[PDB]
C-alpha cells in the first residue's frame, strides 16, 4: 500500500473542518454570524411555525458539539450540516430578510474556506 492511510487523511480533513468552524466563530465574523451561534429559538421569537417548515434545525454551536464528539464520519458530512444550517435560514425567512443576507455572507466564508481543504474531500 504505502503512502498515507485513508483513516489518517479523513482525520486530517476533519481537523481542517474544525479549523473552518473555528474561523466562522471568530469575532471577525460576529457582525453576520451571531444569528447562527445557537439553535433558533422559535418559542422566544414567536416563530410558532418554525419546526413545521424546518424539519432539521442546525447551528454552529450544534455542529461544534458534534465535531467535539467525533460524530462526523468525514468532511462531506460536516459540510452537509453547515449547508443545512444555511438552507434552513433561506427556507424559513423571506428572501429580502436581513438574516438571509447575513447567511450568504457567512456562507461566502464557509464555501471559500471549505473548498481550500487540501486535495479533495474523502468519504
Amino acid at each position: 500500500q504505502h503512502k498515507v492511510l485513508k483513516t489518517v487523511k479523513v482525520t486530517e480533513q476533519l481537523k481542517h473542518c474544525s479549523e473552518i468552524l473555528k474561523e466562522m466563530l471568530a469575532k471577525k465574523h460576529l457582525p453576520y454570524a451571531w444569528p447562527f451561534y445557537n439553535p433558533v429559538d422559535a418559542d422566544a421569537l414567536g416563530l410558532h411555525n418554525y419546526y413545521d417548515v424546518v424539519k432539521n434545525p442546525m447551528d454552529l454551536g450544534t455542529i461544534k458539539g458534534k465535531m467535539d464528539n467525533q460524530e462526523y464520519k468525514d468532511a462531506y458530512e460536516f459540510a452537509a450540516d453547515v449547508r443545512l444550517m444555511f438552507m434552513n435560514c433561506y427556507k424559513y425567512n423571506p428572501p429580502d430578510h436581513e438574516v438571509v443576507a447575513m447567511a450568504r455572507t457567512l456562507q461566502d466564508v464557509f464555501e471559500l474556506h471549505f473548498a481550500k481543504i487540501p486535495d479533495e474531500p474523502i468519504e
Binding site: 444569528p35 433558533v40 414567536g46 416563530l47 418554525y50 425567512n93 436581513e98 438574516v99
Partner: peptide, 7 residues
C-alpha cells in the same frame, strides 16, 4: 405569517 426579528 410570522417573521424573525433580529434585535
Amino acid at each position: 405569517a410570522p417573521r424573525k426579528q433580529l434585535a
